[PDB]
């Protein structure tokens, strides 16, 4: 009155599958929650470890009967999907990141600290608050050069670059137009002297 394993599994492995279920649903929930501002990397770092740990535990019988039972191996697909999303985001995180976040928080508070059209306001004060931030950003690309480096840092710098240009007209004045016309029209004047002077040296 008992087929061994083919219709039903033992009640010694089903709680493992329910535990992986409880992990994966909540991981998808936290991962989904981050919106336009991306805080997923910095908020779903603890519960990403547990899912992987659970997968390793299941992997370590009760591994042939539970992920080589059929086509459409759904546990391997979910795990694989999480692994793929994690690698392309490329978190690798934390002190430097924390410092950058603090700077971003500070830099952003000075905008509404000096806010109130007429965007020609006292924002010259935020100039030295702005530029060094971007300078640090370039230095951070020199640190992770030896591709996108993260997603918290990229979006945080993206928001500042979107605010700095296309809603606050913060353009830089230009000083040099007449020298880069004079030098260019002087250098483009030597061939019409050269060929015409070599033509008239036939006597």
């Amino acid at each position: 009155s008992l087929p061994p394993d083919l219709p039903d599994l033992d009640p010694e492995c089903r709680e493992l599958l329910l535990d992986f279920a409880n992990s994966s649903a909540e991981l998808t929930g936290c991962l989904v929650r981050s919106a336009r501002p991306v805080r997923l990397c910095q908020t779903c770092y603890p519960l990403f470890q547990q899912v992987v740990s659970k997968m390793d535990n299941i992997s370590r019988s009760c591994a042939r009967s539970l992920l080589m039972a059929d086509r459409m191996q759904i546990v391997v697909i979910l795990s694989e999907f999480f692994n793929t999303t994690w690698q392309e985001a490329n978190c690798a995180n934390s002190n430097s990141t924390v410092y950058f976040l603090n700077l971003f928080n500070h830099t952003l508070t000075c905008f509404e600290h000096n806010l109130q059209k007429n965007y020609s306001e006292v924002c010259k004060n935020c100039r030295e608050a702005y530029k060094t931030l971007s300078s640090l950003y370039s230095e951070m690309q020199k640190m992770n050069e030896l591709t996108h480096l993260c997603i918290d840092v990229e979006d945080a710098m993206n928001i500042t670059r979107k605010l700095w240009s296309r809603t606050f007209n913060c353009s830089v004045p230009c000083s040099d137009t007449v020298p880069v016309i004079a030098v260019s029209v002087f250098i483009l004047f030597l061939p019409v002297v050269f060929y015409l002077s070599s033509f008239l040296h036939s006597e």
Binding site: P179, I187, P191
Partner: protein, 673 residues
């Protein structure tokens, strides 16, 4: 009267006929040819990677100085002190690259193809094969591409792969220090052209990636009779050169288990219907017309350059001014751009930001800072909506005139890649316009039209049909695309031949080389081959004297290289030529002993008779070939011409009904039509 021909016939004597009996008594004469055709490809692949490794490191040194210079002269004062720096950096390299050519020897000027499809034809152009020409050409194309000029590097691989073909085949190194006693039996012609054919088909494969195109190139120029063994060695020498270029560059970059980058230029991986077959024909006519504008006004320039600037002091200055204008026009054209795009991937090698928002980068600084090959690959494979169609217009309309004004200079570089880039530029610009007037669902992808504009522009500039269809089929790695490309290049020749000649043919006709080409004109079909000869013949009987042959060689008013022998009024019993004759006078063979090897001594150069000071008689039997290729009179010219060309002949001899010599047909007589 300066370009003397090449002897491809082996004038069998009794000495040759005895020496070949001696060497045949374990058949070790042909197994020594496969060694030369093996290590004639390795030595070409190593030159082709030595250029490529050096030029990208020097370009990486030169461009990062400039992009670090105009990142600090922004945000502050003027940019003109960086424009002067980029002008003088483009002048300082091309100064040396033009001095080492305009003073030492002018033969290395231009590309290498018109001086090597005339040697292949049988005309020994002065110098050319000397080591010094190799050293100055392979060190003149490095110093000019990084110099900053609109010139390709895959041009001079054919000539540089042909010089090392006829230098290790001899085993002499005639500069000094003979370096071998090995590789006799090859110190003659009929081996010289057989190894230059295997050298020049190892530079076409090593620069494009097509081994089976190289053999068709070397055959197309080499119109000899078909022998399977020689083609089966040219194919073996061609297949090596695209394997010792993968295996060195793949050691250089990364892991050895990735055998991509098949040559110096690498088209990517690569779907059409019948309903757009007329559209491609409508491209090819355009590819003729603009081609016949590129190939015409250059002509009106080049005779000007040959009329007034014919001295080494001026053309160096003129190359320096071409480099400075090429700098300044590009800097003005990127200074005034308004189109800026966010970066992605590796589409920009050196990203330049000036007068643009943060994060975004100027798009006009692309296609000036990176190499032409990477820009041509990017024009084939970018997804749609990636180029602003005002950028490509001002880029093509400048780069066309710069590539026209740069070619014909006294520097050493090719003209292939500045034709593919122009062709892909207006091909993609034409492919965008088929999307802004239809919906452009599937069949209006610009990746097709950027290919078949680049195939059209080559046929418009360099009329080359059979050996170019194959190398456009092999580098694209797709045999479905072989049918429209053939249909494009077929059009762009027969539209362009109405107006003006080829680009490689003007630089042959403007140096008065004879250069007889395959087939004969059908309007001159009935010339009957007695009009086309020299009517008096200064032949010499066998065994008269010595003073007769001395006074027939030493004569200022006429230079003749071949003399037929007669008997009794005349019989045409074979012919003797000057080289053998002054070899016999350098020794004393007067009838009053030597093997075949004596004739070979001082083979490359034969001493003139004025140094052969000081009767009796000499017997010219067993030193002449007893059977020249003779023709009668009364024969049609097409038949006479085919026979002369299809075999390799320097001295055709016409006869009478009773076998009497009545005229001698040489190469310059057939060439004039």
């Amino acid at each position: 009267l300066k370009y003397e021909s090449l002897d491809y016939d082996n004038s069998e004597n009794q000495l040759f006929l005895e020496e070949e009996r001696r060497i045949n008594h374990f058949r070790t004469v042909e197994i020594k040819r496969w060694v030369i055709c093996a290590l004639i490809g390795i030595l070409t692949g190593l030159v082709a990677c030595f250029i490529d490794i050096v030029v990208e490191n020097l370009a990486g040194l030169k461009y990062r100085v400039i992009k670090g210079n105009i990142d600090k002269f922004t945000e502050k004062g003027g940019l003109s002190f960086s424009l002067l720096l980029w002008a003088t950096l483009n002048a300082a390299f091309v100064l040396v690259g033009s001095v080492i050519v305009a003073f030492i020897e002018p033969v290395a000027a231009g590309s290498g193809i018109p001086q090597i499809k005339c040697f292949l034809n049988g005309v020994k152009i002065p110098h050319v094969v000397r080591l010094k020409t190799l050293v100055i050409k392979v060190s003149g194309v490095i110093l000019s591409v990084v110099g900053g000029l609109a010139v390709g590097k895959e041009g001079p691989m054919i000539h540089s792969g042909s010089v090392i073909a006829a230098g290790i085949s001899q085993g002499r190194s005639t500069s000094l220090k003979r370096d071998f006693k090995i590789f006799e039996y090859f110190r003659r012609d009929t081996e010289k052209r057989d190894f230059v054919s295997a050298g020049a088909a190892a530079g076409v494969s090593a620069a494009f990636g097509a081994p089976v195109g190289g053999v068709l190139f070397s055959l197309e120029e080499g119109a000899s009779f078909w022998n399977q063994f020689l083609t089966w060695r040219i194919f073996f020498a061609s297949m090596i050169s695209t394997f010792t270029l993968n295996f060195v560059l793949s050691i250089y970059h990364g892991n050895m288990w990735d055998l991509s980058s098949p040559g110096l230029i690498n088209f990517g991986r690569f779907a059409y219907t019948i309903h757009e077959i007329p559209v491609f024909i409508a491209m090819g006519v355009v590819g003729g017309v603009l081609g016949a504008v590129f190939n015409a006004l250059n002509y009106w320039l080049t005779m000007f350059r040959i009329r007034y600037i014919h001295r080494p002091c001026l053309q160096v200055i003129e190359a320096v001014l071409v480099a400075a204008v090429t700098a300044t026009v590009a800097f003005v054209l990127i200074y005034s751009s308004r189109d800026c795009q966010p970066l992605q991937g590796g589409s920009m090698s050196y990203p330049l930001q000036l007068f643009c928002a943060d994060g975004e980068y100027n798009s006009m600084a692309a296609a000036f800072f990176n190499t032409p090959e990477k820009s041509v690959v990017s024009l084939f494979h970018d997804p749609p909506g990636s180029y602003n169609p005002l950028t490509l217009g001002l880029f093509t309309l400048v780069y066309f005139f710069l590539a026209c004004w740069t070619y014909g200079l006294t520097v050493s570089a090719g003209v292939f890649i500045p034709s593919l880039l122009i062709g892909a530029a207006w091909g993609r610009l034409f492919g965008i316009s088929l999307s802004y007037l239809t919906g452009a669902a599937i069949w209006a992808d610009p990746g097709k039209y950027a290919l078949m504009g680049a195939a059209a522009q080559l046929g418009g500039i360099v009329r080359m049909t059979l050996s170019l269809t194959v190398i456009m089929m092999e580098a694209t790695s797709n045999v479905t695309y072989g049918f429209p490309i053939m249909l494009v290049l077929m059009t762009a020749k027969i539209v362009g031949d109405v107006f003006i000649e080829g680009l490689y043919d003007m630089h042959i006709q403007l140096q008065s080389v004879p250069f007889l080409h395959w087939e004969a004109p059908v309007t001159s079909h009935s010339l009957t081959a007695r009009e086309v000869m020299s009517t008096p013949v200064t032949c010499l009987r066998r065994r008269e004297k010595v003073g007769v042959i001395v006074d027939v060689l030493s004569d200022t008013a006429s230079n003749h290289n071949g003399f037929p022998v007669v008997e009794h009024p005349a019989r045409l019993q074979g012919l003797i030529l000057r080289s053998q004759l002054i070899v016999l006078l350098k020794h004393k063979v007067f009838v009053e002993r030597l093997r075949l090897k004596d004739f070979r001594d001082a083979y490359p150069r034969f001493p003139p008779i004025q140094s052969i000071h000081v009767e009796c008689t000499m017997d010219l039997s067993e030193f002449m070939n007893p059977s020249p290729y003779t023709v009668p009179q009364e024969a049609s010219l097409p038949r006479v011409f085919k026979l002369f060309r299809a075999l390799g002949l320097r001295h055709l001899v016409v006869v009478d009904n009773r076998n009497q010599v009545v005229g001698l047909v040489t190469r310059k007589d057939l060439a004039r039509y």
